[PDB]
């Protein structure tokens, strides 16, 4: 049982949950790959044992493990798989798995919220325009005039044979990525590839730096067809700075809903390739990674020129000074527009509070240090000096290949 | 069969084939990762194969692998372990082995410099008094009036018959930390214990925040003896801010030379428990860690307060703003005083060049992401977006238990 120490207070705990599940990760005694983004790369006899496990702790979590419906719900499942080969989850199991996957996501820092998750059952889906309205209800519910609410909508579980539901966008709201005469980009370069497939399926492009891409949705077998998003529905915040009057004139906006639409939800040994979850942003994701990264909008030196910073030497810390202000403008703009947002300090302190909660409840908590520590001011936040264990529990959100 | 490592800023791909000959195993398993742990751990025949591996290494580097001179040295070493249970490194083998141990140090971002290491051979050392003067000369050569040089002094190897030479101090230069009436700490809280020791070994303590500690030096089988560093040997730097002139009224100072003194150097199976080494500082170690860590000097709030930042709420990002200016003051103070120093932008940039040199040469480079990435402004640096394989090669610097 790993001795996990916190170097700031001195506290000692043991992660006893690290032993309680496996799905083997990347590291071996001869090298750790914890810093890698994808763990390497991406007859149903024990679909039962994955469902045996899930149902077993579902009843553990409501006391009623032991007799009654517990030793009874074990039978409906094994009977269902006996003659069907797959099975259906009771609607509360779906809600409980949906929340457990969140609780288990090692890379997520906002898990203090894991128990407030709105779960839209959409397994009754089978059409493209159908999904699109399920998405569009999600977006309106989650966005909620800028008082954001965690939400996931679960689309039908991939069945043995016959296709999958899949969203071709990384997120519901993504900006345009337009190449040109330079092989360079105006817009967002993370999404250059999907702008390829948007136009390749009938999308007429647009202006430039901030074009909200169209959803590319596909229902089993039938190929993907595009879908446009109502501008009345994609809520967005224009970026301004409380004291640098010129920041607004840079014409920067970012959207409000972080909703990732390409991961695969696994509950009780069923795989849901369409399961968009949605929360609210931590400020650094917008200010530091999305805007400041050299392979994203890369605004850093442009903001530094406007601040009159000495860009002639790295020891001026001009990159650091401008990054902070970019972050200040993000929090400020979202607060003016009354859009839910959290700063990395507030966020990390809540994760520390979560770690304590999980300590008494499950004797531990899987966490990926390199994703929990914010991409600026890391050592200034209480999670930096806190050791962390990373493992794979189920239910969980996983990565999956793209449809090409 | 080797890990694929991606740079995400740029999209570079290589495979770390060097990790295959990892000469010892670490703390991770496929069940769970412990890469963020600070301390993972805490006869003639293996000593033969270790030493065999080093000799092979040493002779490849002088491009004379598998010569008579090479088979002579192998046959010599086993002959001497037969007779005595140990062997002796030739001076050239010692220099190479100290270089490689630096080269292999996965948590050092300074490794671009690994070939330019001044190795002082102190293996003929005899007393704890001789020990003191080998160290003073080390400090003098490495300090070099502010124009810092990298250096290591190797005291005699561990061997059966007598005990170890040991330097008790974690670093050659450290400031005292005094417990208090308030239960608090005056000075550096990282050094309360070594301060407790010095007092009870006769040192009459001061009552400042920046009192340089004496050396507790241990000759084999003797108790440790106290030695005062000559003041004019310890180059110090008063910290000033280039545009916040009230900063100099804080009294803050740091020393020029970081000289790590409590690590074990291991070469071809032989162990040097006393082999202190020194380089120059990266500004973040002083500014962020030593000065801003809440369990260290903890100046952040008092600086932010003087800056007239809004301390009531974190969304103002006061912590980040105070931190950046504390760093700017360190880089400025050290450049004013003509004392070598490197900022985290230059340091991570040269470490990326090292990674590229090291992939062409050895086919990989062991590195601990959580330590390579600076404690502020991570994603502003190019090491953030670089995947890294962590593993342990020999020769090596290892931790060892405190001798008390
Ligand atoms: C409501 C507040 C939330 C916050 C502040 C938050 C924040 C974050 C952050 C900051 C990261 C990774 C760091 C980065 O990529 O920049 C992350 C990752 C993640 N979060 Fe959360 N999130 C929230 C809600 C949710 C919800 C509701 C779910 C699912 C039900 C979720 C699941 C995940 C997953 C799966 C990842 C991993 C992404 C990947 O591996 O690519 N999060 N989250
Ligand atoms: C000359 C410039 C050097 C620089 C700029 C440098 C920088 C650093 C930094 C910043 C860290 C730790 C990161 C942190 O804790 O904040 C580190 C760790 C380390 N360095 Fe270097 N270093 C230098 C020279 C050397 C030399 C000369 C050696 C030995 C020959 C060395 C060996 C090590 C080792 C073993 C560690 C790990 C210490 C531990 O595990 O606790 N470095 N270095
Ligand atoms: C190569 N790595 C780059 C990347 C990435 C990434 C992709 C995504 F689709 C979502 C997020 C952020 C995830 C997130 C999710 C939620 C629910 C909230 C939040 N604040 N961030 C990051
Ligand atoms: C709990 N973790 C906090 C920390 C730390 C730290 C630990 C160490 F053992 C050495 C150094 C300083 C390392 C160093 C050595 C040299 C020679 C140069 C340099 N710039 N830094 C920092
Ligand atoms: C707990 C945490 O992993 C540990 O304190 C490490 C993390 N990485 C670090 N990285 C640097 N550069 N300096 C540090 O002190 C630390 N501390
Ligand atoms: C190479 C590195 O591990 C990788 O880029 C990780 C590191 N930390 C991150 N942190 C955040 N917030 N987002 C990321 O995509 C990453 N990526
Ligand atoms: Cl994003
Ligand atoms: Cl230090
Ligand atoms: Gd101007
Ligand atoms: Gd001033
Ligand atoms: Zn690992
Ligand atoms: Zn620290």
């Amino acid at each position: 049982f790993p001795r996990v120490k916190n170097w700031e207070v001195g506290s000692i705990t043991y992660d006893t949950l690290s032993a309680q599940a496996q799905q083997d990760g990347p590291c071996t005694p001869r090298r750790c790959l914890g810093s890698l983004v994808f763990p390497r790369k991406l007859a149903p006899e024990q679909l039962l044992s994955q469902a045996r496990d899930f149902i077993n702790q579902y009843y553990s979590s409501i006391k009623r493990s032991g007799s009654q419906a517990h030793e009874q719900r074990l039978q409906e499942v094994e009977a269902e798989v006996a003659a069907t080969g797959t099975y259906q989850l009771r609607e509360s199991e779906l809600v409980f798995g949906a929340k457990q996957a969140w609780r288990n996501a090692p890379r997520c820092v906002g898990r203090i919220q894991w128990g407030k998750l709105q779960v839209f059952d959409a397994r009754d889906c089978r059409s493209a325009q159908e999904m699109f309205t399920y998405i569009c209800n999600h977006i309106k519910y989650a966005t909620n005039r800028g008082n954001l609410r965690s939400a996931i909508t679960v689309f039908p579980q991939r069945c043995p044979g016959r296709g999958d539901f899949r969203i071709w966008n990384s997120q519901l709201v993504r900006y345009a990525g337009y190449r040109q005469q330079d092989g360079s980009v105006r817009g967002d370069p993370a999404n250059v590839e999907i702008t390829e497939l948007c136009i390749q399926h009938g999308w007429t492009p647009g202006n430039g730096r901030f074009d909200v891409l169209p959803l590319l949705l596909q229902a089993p077998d039938e190929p993907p067809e595009l879908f446009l998003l109502p501008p009345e529905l994609v809520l967005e915040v224009p970026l301004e700075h409380p004291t640098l009057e010129w920041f607004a004139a840079l014409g920067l906006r970012w959207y409000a809903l972080p909703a990732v639409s390409n991961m695969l939800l696994e509950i009780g040994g069923l795989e849901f390739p369409a399961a968009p979850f949605s929360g609210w942003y931590m400020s650094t994701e917008i200010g530091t990674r999305n805007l400041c990264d050299p392979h994203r909008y890369n605004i850093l030196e442009d903001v530094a020129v406007c601040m009159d910073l000495d860009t002639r030497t790295t020891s001026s810390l001009w990159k650091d000074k401008a990054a902070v202000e970019i972050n200040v403008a993000v929090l400020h703009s979202y607060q003016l527009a009354k859009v839910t947002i959290v700063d990395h300090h507030a966020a990390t302190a809540s994760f520390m509070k979560h770690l304590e909660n999980e300590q008494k409840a499950r004797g531990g908590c899987p966490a990926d240090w390199a994703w929990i520590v914010p991409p600026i001011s890391g050592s200034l936040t209480p999670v930096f000096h806190q050791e962390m264990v990373n493992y794979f529990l189920s239910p969980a959100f996983r990565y999956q290949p793209d449809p090409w």
Side-chain angles (χ1 to χ4, degrees), chain A:
Chain A
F1 291 157
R3 171 256 198 186
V4 169
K5 179 167 190 183
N6 178 310
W7 292 95
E8 168 175 321
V9 201
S11 12
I12 295 281
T13 60
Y14 292 87
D15 206 285
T16 42
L17 175 64
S18 58
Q20 257 78 330
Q22 206 212 222
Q23 175 72 288
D24 278 358
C27 295
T28 91
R30 290 170 96 248
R31 83 288 187 89
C32 130
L33 298 161
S35 91
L36 265 60
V37 176
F38 307 104
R40 190 156 270 238
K41 260 193 278 188
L42 324 153
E45 91 157 345
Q46 267 164 241
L47 193 153
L48 186 131
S49 292
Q50 301 178 77
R52 237 205 290 236
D53 294 15
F54 174 64
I55 301 154
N56 269 298
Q57 99 237 44
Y58 177 89
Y59 283 91
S60 307
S61 77
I62 49 202
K63 178 268 153 164
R64 318 279 287 127
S65 71
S67 74
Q68 264 292 61
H70 176 218
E71 68 173 25
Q72 151 165 321
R73 170 55 173 163
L74 305 163
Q75 270 58 20
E76 179 105 44
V77 176
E78 64 171 24
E80 272 186 44
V81 158
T84 292
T86 198
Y87 69 98
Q88 304 317 121
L89 292 158
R90 290 192 185 176
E91 202 145 278
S92 57
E93 305 165 343
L94 164 70
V95 177
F96 171 92
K99 277 136 91 182
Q100 281 292 118
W102 190 3
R103 187 190 194 187
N104 292 339
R107 300 192 166 155
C108 180
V109 72
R111 277 180 285 173
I112 197 51
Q113 286 296 307
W114 75 270
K116 313 198 207 65
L117 178 70
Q118 179 65 62
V119 184
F120 301 104
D121 186 0
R123 302 174 278 160
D124 336 298
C125 196
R126 22 190 298 281
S127 150
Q129 176 64 244
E130 215 158 292
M131 283 215 335
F132 176 65
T133 338
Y134 271 116
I135 277 156
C136 279
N137 274 321
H138 187 151
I139 284 167
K140 71 87 196 171
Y141 169 100
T143 305
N144 183 39
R145 292 256 189 256
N147 179 43
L148 258 34
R149 306 182 288 204
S150 321
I152 177 177
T153 71
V154 181
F155 287 89
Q157 92 223 34
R158 136 209 295 172
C159 59
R162 280 44 249 169
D164 338 323
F165 291 79
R166 292 208 45 188
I167 300 188
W168 289 32
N169 300 66
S170 75
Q171 279 168 56
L172 294 188
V173 190
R174 297 264 67 197
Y175 284 144
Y178 299 140
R179 197 83 64 84
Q180 41 230 344
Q181 76 287 322
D182 289 8
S184 107
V185 184
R186 92 178 289 116
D188 191 354
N191 310 319
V192 158
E193 142 130 56
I194 184 62
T195 321
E196 158 174 359
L197 300 179
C198 274
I199 290 171
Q200 192 180 298
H201 290 52
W203 162 246
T204 297
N207 191 67
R209 291 245 197 266
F210 293 132
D211 303 342
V212 181
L213 280 166
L215 260 45
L216 260 166
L217 312 190
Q218 67 166 0
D221 304 281
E222 316 203 7
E225 292 79 58
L226 284 154
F227 281 101
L228 219 164
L229 281 175
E232 313 248 35
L233 189 47
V234 165
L235 163 58
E236 297 187 349
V237 168
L239 303 189
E240 79 150 352
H241 189 294
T243 67
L244 314 180
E245 305 76 358
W246 47 262
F247 202 106
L250 298 175
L252 306 160
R253 359 135 89 166
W254 202 256
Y255 54 86
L257 203 59
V260 355
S261 53
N262 66 11
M263 294 193 59
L264 183 149
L265 169 63
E266 178 191 55
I267 297 174
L270 291 351
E271 302 176 343
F272 303 86
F277 47 94
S278 146
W280 54 81
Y281 263 118
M282 185 179 60
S283 55
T284 61
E285 309 185 67
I286 304 159
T288 303
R289 292 309 309 304
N290 283 316
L291 295 183
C292 289
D293 267 13
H295 56 297
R296 303 290 283 245
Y297 281 91
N298 189 13
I299 72 180
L300 203 67
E301 39 184 310
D302 297 283
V303 173
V305 170
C306 297
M307 295 172 64
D308 245 81
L309 295 181
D310 178 14
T311 71
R312 288 198 200 253
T313 177
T314 63
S315 42
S316 63
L317 301 192
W318 64 264
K319 286 178 163 243
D320 316 74
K321 287 164 153 157
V324 180
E325 293 315 332
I326 291 171
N327 252 264
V328 149
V330 162
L331 292 160
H332 174 86
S333 303
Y334 277 59
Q335 281 163 12
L336 226 52
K338 298 162 184 180
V339 172
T340 301
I341 203 171
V342 66
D343 71 60
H344 50 293
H345 297 303
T348 52
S350 73
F351 184 74
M352 294 303 303
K353 174 57 178 173
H354 175 70
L355 284 178
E356 208 167 4
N357 292 349
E358 276 288 306
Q359 194 61 59
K360 184 151 188 66
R362 298 205 288 180
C365 165
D368 193 331
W369 191 90
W371 286 59
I372 298 288
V373 179
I376 83 173
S377 312
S379 132
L380 306 190
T381 64
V383 295
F384 184 92
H385 298 97
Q386 170 66 66
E387 297 174 332
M388 278 165 199
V389 185
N390 196 11
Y391 44 94
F392 186 124
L393 308 169
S394 203
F397 299 98
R398 309 187 325 200
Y399 299 115
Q400 69 173 118
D402 293 338
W404 50 76

